[PDB]
Design a binder for this molecule. Structure first.
Ligand SMILES: C[C@@H](COc1ccc([C@@H]2Oc3ccc(O)cc3S[C@@H]2c2ccc(O)cc2)cc1)N1CCCC1
Ligand SMILES: C[C@@H](COc1ccc([C@@H]2Oc3ccc(O)cc3S[C@@H]2c2ccc(O)cc2)cc1)N1CCCC1
Lengths: 245, 245
């Protein structure tokens, strides 16, 4: 990502995109019988495996230590799931496309206590994306910034290693800024519109953080999975051998 | 803020800055006897009055409806308190300057259950500001963006009035982006450094949001004041007559 061109970062990120998964329920069977949170939790857990694969293809990420990769993902995984959900919901006003076979409106969120509040925030984000005409190339840049940025301030220590890690991350974020600006210039925005649009995009990331924080608060009202710490499951997933090479 | 120059926004914001308040405790008396949360809560409540005064001097803010002013402040007040705290702590590594007569280190945070975690996040933000060499002129721009941005996505409705309000806010944020870019150009940064520094600044705002959200979670473990809704107290403060004109 540090000698990669702007055109090469954009292609690398497009190449890395995870697949769109389906909800797992029998579509020949009724709906009142379904646990909406079970459906959503099962979907999200399945996406997480693919998020790990994606993160390893973000330029610069695997040059980090395993521990720092785990930390970043532990800090950003729900933001990353949510921006992906808002992105595929963009062309579906008033609805959230959790999966191609699971498209829910706000009243379907009332089904779970405290969940309509989260739905409403997600829906508003999707509407802002649509109104901004967010582009596929801009979205993958944003998703990678979330991955690199959300946990970069909470690394405990400040060892030599740690200082080098933070420098490298800030260097990669810098190149993704250069890429976003490059995309906007290519599109024919003036200098002035570029910086304004860059700021508009980056401020949405503070809303996504808000949504992740609220969603974490909401998810922690027990019912879901909280077995084995998240660190450990992420590490297991991230700490791959190379035998299947 | 919409026909204001970049030089006029910067001066308007510098002019609007609130005063630095002191902690209210008898400095002739011992410390173990002090409620650290009482001291911090009393300080923060006193700052809030001055925050309302400041917000009314941010270009564009008072052109909003009273209700929308209340909403923005309800969404941003803790972020705004925290960025002010990190800013005055910048030149005090390892310590948080809550007031000139109340300078606390992380171990003094352990005094309150769950508070050291918040202190540690604040301290790390202060260190990042220092390392970035954040400037007084950049800080007031950031503080005003927080005020305008944090609640702009959660307005319920979408009345004509509401749509006009959102447009105006996004227009003001745009001019503050123009101002930040103007400040950086004046300082002699290249085009490339400007956009990179703009992005570095705006991404810190996602960390400040995180800290506010965590702090709200922490403050809600009862002991503090939660009497009369915050909306209502903000409204009271904001809904001024003009008789003392
Ligand atoms: C905690 C469990 C389940 O996590 C979940 C479960 C459900 C969802 C909910 O469903 C999805 C499903 C896929 C997707 O890409 C996004 C979301 S968001 C939504 C949600 C989030 C928070 C909230 O308060 C209400 C709804 C999102 C995450 N595992 C997640 C991976 C590690 C543990
Ligand atoms: C809720 C009460 C008190 O709010 C407070 C009380 C204390 C502080 C704590 O003390 C200050 C004091 C001044 C300042 O500018 C910032 C902070 S931050 C800190 C804090 C915040 C969250 C947390 O979990 C732990 C420490 C910040 C806000 N009133 C606030 C205005 C309306 C109600």
């Amino acid at each position: 990502a540090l000698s990669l061109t702007a055109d090469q970062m954009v292609s690398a990120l497009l190449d890395a995109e995870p697949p769109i998964l389906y909800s797992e329920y029998d579509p020949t069977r009724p709906f009142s019988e379904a646990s909406m949170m079970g459906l959503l939790t099962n979907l999200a857990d399945r996406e997480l495996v693919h998020m790990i694969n994606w993160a390893k293809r973000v330029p610069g990420f695997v040059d980090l230590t395993l521990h720092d990769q785990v930390h970043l993902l532990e800090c950003a995984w729900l933001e990353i799931l949510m921006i992906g959900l808002v992105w595929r919901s963009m062309e579906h006003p008033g609805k959230l496309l959790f999966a191609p076979n699971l498209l829910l409106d706000r009243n379907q969120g009332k089904c779970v206590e405290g969940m309509v509040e989260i739905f409403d925030m997600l829906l508003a984000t999707s509407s802002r994306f649509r109104m901004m005409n967010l582009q596929g190339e801009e979205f993958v840049c944003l998703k990678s910034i979330i991955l690199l940025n959300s946990g970069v301030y909470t690394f405990l220590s400040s060892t030599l290693k740690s200082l080098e890690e933070k420098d490298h991350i800030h260097r990669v974020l810098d190149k993704i800024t250069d890429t976003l600006i490059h995309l906007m210039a290519k599109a024919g925005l003036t200098l002035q519109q570029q910086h304004q649009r860059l700021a508009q995009l980056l401020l949405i990331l503070s809303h996504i953080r808000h949504m992740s924080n609220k969603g974490m608060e909401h998810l922690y009202s027990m019912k879901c999975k909280n077995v084995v710490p998240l660190y450990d499951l992420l590490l297991e997933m991230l700490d791959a051998h190379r035998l299947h090479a």
